[PDB]
Design a protein around this ligand. Structure first.
Ligand SMILES: *[C@@H]1O[C@H](CO)[C@@H](O[C@@H]2O[C@H](CO)[C@@H](O[C@@H]3O[C@H](CO)[C@@H](O)[C@H](O)[C@@H]3O)[C@H](O)[C@H]2NC(C)=O)[C@H](O)[C@H]1NC(C)=O
Ligand SMILES: *[C@@H]1O[C@H](CO)[C@@H](O[C@H]2O[C@H](CO)[C@@H](O)[C@H](O)[C@H]2NC(C)=O)[C@H](O)[C@H]1NC(C)=O
Ligand code: NAG
Ligand code: NAG
Length: 319
């Protein structure tokens, strides 16, 4: 031989000076690329007179960054800790990442940026809204609260609360929206005709105060017996006293609440406003029976025109 040929390309290295052929006596140098390393340092060779480059034992491998697989209270995502890999971080519920959430292993074999740590999310003590009191509240980390902890507010007597009464410690370290407590008033409730109404002996009625209604015999409420002063300044309802109905026939089987009853029994004392029943009517043609409805409305009940009073449409087969 008279010249050495182009030197072989080894895995993660560079050769210098890189030429396609060399005169015996010229020198080349193999180095690992930045970020890799090899047992034995760099290797130098002189082209020999035979024109054959000698055996190259250079073996370049990536620098390894210090072990970073364990993040207290969190998780690390990774494949290997070698140049030039990246590792990412995240924290368990309740903690926040104090630092960068990703890091790369550098040419120098250091992590960049520096590795983070997880830390507990906390909220300082909540502030108490204007006309309220703090019912349910207890610190769980020094004088502060932990993530998802809660505090519960209760308004002062005569005040209505607007917005949830419960707050939670969030991840941004503050609590969720606070509620407000305004005082609310209701006008006195009106006495219903044929009835009476009762309510506390105060000169003024506030939120949550209650009134109860009653009727004189022969009448009944067409609403709830008890009513409340609501947060919007009006009452939950204003029932009135409606007239009862005398039973409209002397004897008859009717359907009352999907069930047969003898009208003059079930309604011994009259039918209340609202009460609905179904009379039985006979279809002379098909010799069977159907029912028409009727309802007591403030003292009147219209008995279906087809109804006949006492062989009993009640005892005839259905259509
Ligand atoms: C608790 O603290 C967090 C974090 O600072 C607060 O969240 C921040 O809320 C503001 C407004 O709600 C966000 O800014 C911008 O406001 C405009 C309003 O003109 C809105 O149109 C935009 O969409 C945007 O939200 C800000 O980005 C947001 N910050 C974060 C990190 O989410 C939160 O308000 C605080 N909670 C309470 C109850 O004070
Ligand atoms: C109490 O007063 C409020 C005040 O208006 C009544 O009306 C509110 O509720 C209605 C429900 O059907 C809504 O249609 C109205 O938009 C709403 N009014 C306002 C100003 O928000 C409310 O119904 C009253 N409640 C009762 C039981 O009578
Ligand atoms: C709790 O708060 C008080 C101040 O009222 C303070 O003196 C004390 O050191 C705090 N405790 C902790 C654990 O931070
Ligand atoms: C507040 O009330 C809402 C009603 O929609 C309820 O779903 C929620 O659980 C309450 N707030 C909190 C923090 O629980």
């Amino acid at each position: 031989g008279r010249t050495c040929p182009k030197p072989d390309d080894l895995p993660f290295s560079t050769v210098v000076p890189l030429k396609t052929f060399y005169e015996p006596g010229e020198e080349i140098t193999y180095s690992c690329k930045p970020g890799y390393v090899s047992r034995g340092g760099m290797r130098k060779f002189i082209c020999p007179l035979t024109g054959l480059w000698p055996i190259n034992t250079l073996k370049c491998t990536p620098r390894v960054c210090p072990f970073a697989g364990i993040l207290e209270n969190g998780a690390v995502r990774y494949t290997t800790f070698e140049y030039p890999n990246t590792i990412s971080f995240s924290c368990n519920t309740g903690f926040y990442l104090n630092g960068a959430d990703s890091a790369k292993c550098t040419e120098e074999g250091k992590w960049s940026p520096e590795l983070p740590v997880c830390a507990p999310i906390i909220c300082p003590p909540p502030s108490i809204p204007t006309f309220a009191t703090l019912r349910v509240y207890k610190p769980s980390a020094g004088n502060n609260s932990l993530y998802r902890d809660t505090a519960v507010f209760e308004c002062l007597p005569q005040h209505a609360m607007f917005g949830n009464d419960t707050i939670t410690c969030t991840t941004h370290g503050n609590w969720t929206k606070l509620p407000e407590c305004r005082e609310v008033k209701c006008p006195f409730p009106s006495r219903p005709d044929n009835g009476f109404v009762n309510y506390p002996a105060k000169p003024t009625l506030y939120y949550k105060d209650k009134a109860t209604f009653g009727c004189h015999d022969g009448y009944s409420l067409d609403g709830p017996e008890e009513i409340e002063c609501t947060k919007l300044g009006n009452w939950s309802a204003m029932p009135s006293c409606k007239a009862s109905c005398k039973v409209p026939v002397k004897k008859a089987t009717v359907v009352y609440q999907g069930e047969r009853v003898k009208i003059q029994e079930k309604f011994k004392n009259g039918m209340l406003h609202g009460d609905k029943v179904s009379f039985f009517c006979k279809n002379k043609e098909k010799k069977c029976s159907y029912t028409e409805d009727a309802q007591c409305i403030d003292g009147t009940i219209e008995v279906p025109k087809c109804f006949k009073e006492h062989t009993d449409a009640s005892d005839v087969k259905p259509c």
